[PDB]
Structures are given as C-alpha cells and as structure tokens.
C-alpha cells in the first residue's frame, strides 16, 4: 500500500527531499540545494494524511525515521548534517550527478507531448534529453521544433480558418454601416502564408529557448531504441552514436498517408505541404472526408478558391452523423463542391512553375461506386486520407515493445509499455483521443509520477473536440447513435433547438442553420451523455460545459443555471423540445 | 406536506386534469378537451413519487379516488362520463369559462419578464391579459412591444457593439492577406441605425403575433392597480376603464435617472434615446461609470467618435475592481478619454438641427474632486447614472404592497408581495440581479406554480454576467474582494494567467492584456467561488462554466477536464500560478 508507493517513488526519482513545512533543518537543506542550483522534488509529510506512516517506512531505506532525508536515483544520501558536510567539502555536485546512465530521461520526439514531458521532468531534477527530427515530405518540405500541431496542424490551420472567416466579416460590415465594397476586395495567399510562417518561426525559437532555460539537452537527431536503455542517434551529417537513459518516453507522432495509386506521391500534396506552400493552390481537389479534409477545403473556398471534395462514403466517420451532414450541407451551400461516393484511380499535365510561383496542372481519373467514371482537371490535389505512425523506424523489434494491429503502442492506464522503463504518449498511444491537449496532459502527469512521487493519472473520457469548418462544430461525449446503441432507444431522450446568432440578423444570414442538442439517459436522472453544437465560436461555447459533464451534469443542472444574454451559448439553458415529441426545432 | 400542496394547486389552477399515462379513459378525456380547444394543465400521477397518496387526497374534493378528474378554478367538474355529458349537451364551454373575474391573470408590463409569464400561463388554460405602455422620454422618444432589453437595451447595444468590433476586423484583415485599406473606410451612423431598428421592428411584430397565437389579450394601455383585484387602464385616447383579475403580476421595469442639475433634462439624452438617434452624436460626453456608460462609450469610440467619460469615483461599482480597472485601461489605450474624479454642475450653444439631421452644441461645466474646474464643449451629452422604478405611477398606496427604501417591491422567495394574489418579477423585485434571463426564468417558473401545480423556485445565486465593452468581461460568482471579506485572506487562493488569442498573433495585437482568474476557498476542497475573464467572446466563454459552478466545481474539477485547442477558454483547464506565490502571470 503506502510501502509500495514509497518504494516506487524512491527508486525512480532523480533527486528528492522528504521534508516538513515547519522544520528549520529542512529549510537549511532546501537553501543549500538552491545555492548549488540543484533542482529536486519535495514531499512535505505534514501535508499527507498518512505522512506518519510514510516517515516510518522511510527507515526501511535509510535506517532513520527523521526529516529531512535526501535521496538521489534510489540511494539515501543523508540527513541535515551529512548534506551540509558534502556541500562544504565540495562533494555534493559530484554526488547528485552520479548515474549509471547518460540521462535520467530520453524523450524521442519533440512535439506536443514530448516537449511538455521533458520540461516537466527537468523541473524536478531529472537530467533530460529531447530528440527531434522531421523527415522531409516527398517534395522536400521540412520545419522546426514543436511537432505537428505547431508547424503543420492546429496552429496554421486555425490561422487560415480565421483568414477565411474575415471574408464574411468584410461582407457583414457593409450591413452594419461601413463604407467598403466587398466585391472589390481580393485575397493574397503569399501575404497570408508569410504572416503564418512568421508566427510559427517564433514558436520554433521559443521552444529552443525554453529547453535551454530548463537545462534540457536538445538534439536535432533521429532516434532509434535499440535496447531498453540504449538510443541510437543519427545527426544531420549522418554521424551515428549511442546514448543511454534510465526512463524512455516514446512521443514520435504520425504522418499523412497516401493512397496506392499512380501519381499520388509524385504529383499530389498533403497538409504537411499546404501550410507553407509558396503559391495559391488554385483550383483544388481535396481527397478524403476527415476533419483535416473538410477544414482545409473550407478555408480554401472562403479565400476565393474553386474547391471540390472527393468523398468515398460519409463525412466525419466516428462523429455524430446528423451533425456531420449539417456541417457538409453548410459547406455545399457556401461554394464547396462534393463528389460523393467516389474514389481516385493522377496524371501530370504541367509541372509546378517554381520560377513564376504558380501551381502545375493535373488530370484526376476515378470512379463512383456504381461504376460511372470521374475525370476532371485540377491545379492542386490534396490527400487527406488518414495518418499513421511508422514505429519500425523508431523501435527495434528485439526491444519487446508490443504494438497493436494499426502499429500503435499498447499501454497501461499509466502509459507504461510491455517494457518496464519505457512509456508512450500522444498519437502513438493505442486507443486514446489524438489531440494536442491530451498529449500535453499525459506528458506532464507522467513526468510527475516518474520524478516527483505523484499518483494522479490522465483521464481520457469525455474529452471535448471542435471541428473548425466554416461553420464550427463542437462536441463533448457520445454521439446520439452511440448512446442509442449502448442503452436502447427507449432510455434515450434528446433535447434540441435551432438558433440564430444576434450578429447574423442585421447581416441577413440564415435563420435556421445553427443547431444544438443534448443526448440524455432517462433512467439515470436524465444524465447528459453528449452535447453537440453547430455555430460560430463553437469551441469557446463547448469548453466550459466539458467541466460540468466531467462532474456528471444532468438536464436539471442545465435548467437551473441561468443564461447570459445575448449569446449563442445561452440556448443550452432553456432547451425543451424533445425529438420524440416530433415538434419542430425551428425558432 | 402533500395535502396542503394539493389544496393550493386546486385553488389556483384555472383548468387542470389529474391523469395517468396508461389509462385509456384519460386519453378519451384529453382528446375531448383538445377538440373543444380547451387548454389545461395535466398532472400524471403514474409519474410522481407520492402519486398514490395524492390520488387518495383527491377524494377530499371529489369523493372519488379514481382517475381522470378535472377541475376548473377550484371546483371539481367530473370524471370521464360526466365530462362527456357536459360536452354532449353543449354545456362544457360555459363551465370552463365561468369566473368571478374578467381574467385569471393580468400582467402589468410587456417586457422580458411579463411577456414570458403571460405566454407560459396561457399554456395551462389561464385566461390572460398583458398590458404594455411606453411613456415617452423628455425629447419624445417611444417604441413598441417587448420592454427595455428588446427596444433600448441588450439587443440594440450588442448590435452596435458588433458594428464597433467590425472596425478591428477590417484592420486585422490586411494582416491576414486581404487587399482593403482600412484607413480609407468610414462609418455611416444612420445606415447602422436603420438596420438595427428594422430588426427591433421584427421583434415588436413577433411578440404581438405570439400573444395572439396563444389567445392572450394584448392591451396597449397604462395600467394602475387600485385594489387587489382591480386594474384601471388608460388607452391611447385617455379612455379610462377597469378590468378585474384573479392573480396579478407586476412587471413594469425601470427607466433612466437624470442628475438634479440645470440643463440635464433639457439638453442631454439617455440610452433610451441613443439607439434610435437620427443623427450621429458627434463629439460626445458620457456621464457615469456603470456597464451602460462604458458599453456605450466603447462602441461610439470604435465607430470613430471623439468620446470622453466623466467618472465620479470608480468604474463598475459592485464588480471585481481589479477586473474593472483592466477594462478601463484597455478603453483608454484604444481611444476613450476619461475625466477622472469629476462631476457635472449643461448649457445649450446650438439647437439640434432636425432638418439637416445634425446634432446641436453644448457647454458642460463641472468640477474635479480637489477643486479644479471642468469646462469643454460637446455635441452630445449622455447620462448613464442609474435606473429606477416609478411604482407610484403603477400602484395605489392603499392596496398594501410593501416597497423598500429604493422603491422596489419586497417579495418572498416565490415572488409573492405582501398582498396574497399580487406578485412581482424582473427589475422591480427588490434585491435580485437585474438581468433579462433572470426575469424570463422568474416569470415562466411563477406561471407554472400558479397554474400547473409546480413547486420549483427560481435560483438567484451565482448568476453569470458579461459586460460588452470593447474587450469583453465575463464573470460568475464572487469578486476577489468579496471572497476575502467573507472568508478571510488566509482561506482564499487565487489562480491566474494572462493569455493571447491565436487570432491576435498575425494581427499584431497586444501580448498580455487578456486575463483570467479563479478565486477559490482553501478549506472547502478549493471550491471555485468566482470566475473572471477579460477577452474576446467572453460571454460564450463564461456561460458553460456557470453550470459547473452551480454544481459546486472545485479547482480539481477544472484540472481533470481537458482543454479544446486552439481556444481562449482552454486556459482555464491548466491554471497553476497563484497570487500568493508572487510569480508573474504573463505569457
Ligand atoms: C492538419 C491537422 C490539424 C490538427 N488540428 C488540431 C486541432 O485543432 N486541435 C487538436 O487538439 N489537435 C489537432 N491536430 C492533432 C495534433 O496535431 C496531434 O494530436 C498532436 O500534434 C500529437 O502530438 P504528439 O506529441 O503525439 O506528436 P507530434 O506533434 O506529431 O510530434 C512528434 C514529433 O517527433 C518527431 N519524430 C518522429 N520520429 C522521430 C524520430 N525517430 N526521432 C526523433 N524525432 C522523431 C516528428 O517529426 C515530430 O516532430 C491536428 C493534426 C493535423 C494533422
Ligand atoms: C442599455 C441597457 C443594456 C442592457 N443590456 C443587458 C444585457 O446585455 N443583458 C441582460 O441580461 N440585461 C441587460 N439589460 C437589462 C435588461 O434590459 C433588464 O434587466 C430587463 O429588460 C428587465 O425586464 P423587466 O421585465 O423587469 O422590465 P422591462 O423589460 O423594462 O419591461 C417593462 C415594461 O413595462 C412597461 N410599463 C411600465 N409601467 C407600465 C404601466 N403602468 N402600465 C403598462 N406598462 C407599463 C414599460 O414601458 C416596459 O415596456 C440592459 C439594460 C439597459 C438599460
Ligand atoms: C500487459 N501489458 N500490455 C501493455 C503494457 C502491459 C503491462 O502490464 N505493462 C506494465 C509493466 C510492469 C513491468 C514491466 S511492464
Ligand atoms: C425555462 N426553462 N428552463 C429549462 C427549460 C425551460 C423551457 O421550458 N424553455 C422555454 C422556452 C425556451 C425558449 C423559448 S420557450
Ligand atoms: C402576502 N403573503 N401571503 C402569503 C405569504 C405572503 C408574504 O410573506 N408576502 C411577501 C412579503 C414581503 C415582505 C414581507 S412579507
Ligand atoms: C497540467 N495541468 N493540469 C492542471 C494544471 C496544470 C499545470 O500545472 N499547468 C502547467 C502549464 C500551463 C501552461 C503553461 S505550463
């Protein structure tokens, strides 16, 4: 119980001090450690309900039951007198740096999860290295430190979404009294990309400064785990060497897939290339139906592009399908064309004009599910048909780390793999939501358990999401069809309503396109199982409700809470029309 | 408790049917009442906890313990045979329509609370009248049905706020690649007012249609309660008559105050006049420091006005003063001038030019709090120095309804006045938050208790707010200073952080102006006592957290909930810097 926790804490902490808030001897040790610039974890036994028991259990390691007690990498170092002896004799530095390994922690992968984990571990005195390398895309695209979200993901895509949203802000402004003429205004792609890339570059730099300031070793090198404690590194001159670490965190993420058809790799691109592309894509085909495919098609259309989406079966597989259809219907009414039930079988007509900064030209041939043919010309073809890890590049099979059928790492609920000192976080952790805030929380909480004696786990249930399509879609919890599957139709009640943002009235926008619903369980006091909203600022709307759902909110909790007026979100506080009543949700 | 409840429900309901969902005899009576277009409340006993005990208590009125049983204004009417007997003999309509009074409910005042109460009561078969009259402002301004929020409050001010926000959207668009030149674009006040007023006109019409479709009598007439059941009405020709009603709801609201100084009434205006003003205000002085004053000064500055605010002492008295100061400093850096610690002692230099649609010119004289004098010319002067009811207009003193020292109605926790059949809701209910969603909930919940046997009360605690200044300010719960006063500084912990919206990066806006904090009580599991946020879309951010605070959220509930990325709201899910630690909150 307590004895198994304390044994795990002492064995894996790099430098840790067992202490009491009221002890002047403990303050003296803390003061010396800060002078020497020795970072460490601290456990204050008068803050724990069973601190009395823990302090007796410490004697099993040190043969004493007093505070303070200092440990380094599993070894009792001393009490107050002994630590001060080592300091005044100039022996303490060499003691706190003694290790069987080069590093207490090696993180393979410098993205959302890996950077968060490495910074948190270094705070408690773990000597840490972060490895990051970006394998170039087929056309040669590469980028800096920070991972998929920072460089080719959430950050550039929401900036480009905002450039798209501003098109409708320019339109609205005339109705609110401003003198501009929207039909006379055009968009400059390269000016936008330059501004987006300048911000990304400031993030690349900020991460390198943060690692430097936390005393983390950053290696721009590709890592491969060749045994439980050995990592082979290849640098930018193909120099190969080996470094060793006590704990290993795998955090290498995923990359886009291509279909196995002629011309796909040679002549199409992916999201990896889009966010730094030097020319406007022009007339564009997006192949796929994920949130990546629809978000990219959406902003390209708002920026004035001629955009088509090729859909194999359905939009947004895995999300609530009533909401997915409403998302696509809005896109189609606002200029995005859809080739439904269709797959591709890519021919090059013109090479990309790198001189004049212009796209090439491609012939796309495909077929509909009934066998009819598809054939049309496009300037750019973007593939958004899923993402995958490539761990047979990071991980020698002899190490013994178990992978599932999709190539992701099978982990315990505390991120441990089948090898005791090796852990995995982020998109490569099998079965977990693949989101930046999840990877960050997992990485921070893991570092605290390894190096500061924490026990708290990451909670992966009911994590909210937002799809940043031209009209945004926020969700938290089950889809309506998943709720009915799990509990049966007779135990599910759905409250819903259309709404119109007040901002849309003077601007003469649509009356009954925005929509929201709560999916509830009758036999469990009308517990809210899932929340869904389509409208502007849907991520801001959804976030706060995610705390209430974590807390077990019921329909009655929504009813008794008062709305803020005038807002979109307040419509959730007065819902009353059920789907089983058959009454229209229009307002 | 069961027997005194049923007594109160039967005496109060206009038409009510006690029923069971499984009974075909009940179904037959429902369809007869529907065919007859007789509206009524229904109590399904096979869905209540103590439904078996109520069924037996019904015999004290009807001498039967069986179901269905229908009652009209306190009298038992009959079972299934007896009701069809009345229907077959064409006796039913005369029975359901017999009453001592003209109406079951008279609502005095057709604003946010009054219209909501009237429509909900009519749902249960209560014969209802709604009286509304708008007394003109000193310069003669008047408007249509719907109250302060609809015509001269939340709706027009947030539309005008949006027109102001679009000026900075026009500025941002250049940085995101759009080809306009903000510096050559101007704003037309009269075009914006026409769009705003056309939307308000559609709401006036919608409310009249809604009342007609619910069989509610709408009288555009001034009402005066002269006895507990008698309302004297004066129509548009000052024809005076009297109508009678069983229950009365006072819902007459407030109007702006003027200071007691020369020239104020003659030459100044209030928010009542601003939202339909036919000329641009020009160089404007706003006198006051309430959320009304700051919201109005805010959008006038963003439209291009030369705007000054004259402040007697502090901004936003009653709100968290750290947050109020941040609100005002942002406004001062973005064009609003402030005349601090200053009060007015108004002279007319030019009369308003109603023909050429031009403002007049005024000389304002005042003094600062030490002794220096204030003297400057303005084209428009706006007073926002509080609001008050004038219930002497509405309520004869002899009726016996107790008012407080401010002229508001003293009520019980179920809105009852000191006269048993008279109730008050909305801004005139003493001590309650003066907000439109509060008035709507109160009115709806009260109507259900009067006419459908409901017991649920309106919960007035922890009601969230938003101030729609140029940078918006949302809050739910206690200010920091009120928490410290209530519990003591050692029992309060405050977590806080600056943030920067992602949308502001490419647009080159400010790094550390947006700000958020959680005020928590240490000795109660670090319960969240109050939430505060300064930033864009603050009302959408705050709303969802109000449900969590209503359910008693702690800091650990915020910690275990995962963020949505990229949003402003997600910063609440990872707060960690305490005020007590002294660490900087900047990003
Ligand atoms: C277009 C797009 C949009 C997205 N939008 C959002 C959004 O709005 N919100 C959201 O929450 N999520 C979004 N995501 C998902 C988000 O990007 C991921 O969930 C997140 O980046 C996962 O972080 P990670 O640490 O697991 O991996 P990554 O961020 O992918 O980091 C892994 C890093 O390790 C490097 N690496 C790989 N192999 C090696 C090796 N052998 N040695 C060294 N380094 C190596 C990789 O090059 C990379 O730099 C989006 C993703 C995409 C593609
Ligand atoms: C500028 C401004 C901005 C505001 N912004 C917001 C906001 O963003 N959010 C928010 O929640 N609240 C806001 N409010 C507050 C909101 O308007 C009020 O809380 C709400 O309107 C109160 O509703 P009510 O039913 O109590 O009264 P009202 O809506 O004022 O309705 C009362 C009606 O009764 C009429 N009446 C008066 N006497 C008589 C009589 N003798 N006979 C017949 N009829 C009579 C009045 O003319 C009026 O039409 C704002 C207020 C102002 C002034
Ligand atoms: C069975 N399994 N599948 C994946 C991960 C595991 C597991 O139990 N790992 C925990 C360990 C403790 C010691 C060494 S590994
Ligand atoms: C008041 N309330 N709290 C919870 C559910 C309800 C409710 O019945 N809403 C009524 C209407 C909302 C919008 C138009 S009518
Ligand atoms: C009149 N009445 N009938 C039953 C209950 C009441 C009542 O308490 N009225 C409200 C009050 C306001 C101030 C003091 S009491
Ligand atoms: C991870 N977490 N969950 C709850 C509170 C925290 C925390 O300590 N936040 C760390 C940082 C936030 C922003 C920059 S560093």
GROMACS .gro file of C-alpha atoms and ligand atoms in nm, chain A residues 119-120 440-441 444-445 448, chain B residues 497 555 558-561 571-577, ligand 6:
model
   35
  119UNK     CA    1   1.007   2.036  -1.945
  120UNK     CA    2   0.807   1.897  -1.652
  440UNK     CA    3   0.032   1.759  -2.312
  441UNK     CA    4  -0.164   1.645  -2.005
  444UNK     CA    5   0.307   1.640  -1.773
  445UNK     CA    6   0.125   1.396  -1.546
  448UNK     CA    7   0.524   1.396  -1.216
 1084UNK     CA    8  -0.285   3.389  -1.610
 1142UNK     CA    9  -1.010   2.351  -0.880
 1145UNK     CA   10  -1.102   2.219  -1.376
 1146UNK     CA   11  -0.767   2.035  -1.363
 1147UNK     CA   12  -0.900   1.691  -1.460
 1148UNK     CA   13  -1.105   1.833  -1.754
 1158UNK     CA   14  -0.655   2.845  -2.048
 1159UNK     CA   15  -0.895   2.776  -1.756
 1160UNK     CA   16  -0.809   2.400  -1.768
 1161UNK     CA   17  -0.438   2.437  -1.685
 1162UNK     CA   18  -0.408   2.735  -1.445
 1163UNK     CA   19  -0.124   2.698  -1.195
 1164UNK     CA   20   0.029   3.035  -1.093
 1180LIG     C1   21  -0.110   2.036  -1.643
 1180LIG     N1   22  -0.203   2.096  -1.554
 1180LIG     N2   23  -0.330   2.048  -1.533
 1180LIG     C2   24  -0.383   2.132  -1.440
 1180LIG     C3   25  -0.290   2.236  -1.401
 1180LIG     C4   26  -0.175   2.211  -1.476
 1180LIG     C5   27  -0.044   2.290  -1.479
 1180LIG     O1   28   0.039   2.279  -1.388
 1180LIG     N3   29  -0.021   2.376  -1.590
 1180LIG     C6   30   0.116   2.381  -1.649
 1180LIG     C7   31   0.121   2.489  -1.753
 1180LIG     C8   32   0.012   2.551  -1.810
 1180LIG     C9   33   0.051   2.649  -1.908
 1180LIG    C10   34   0.187   2.656  -1.921
 1180LIG     S1   35   0.269   2.548  -1.818
   0.00000   0.00000   0.00000
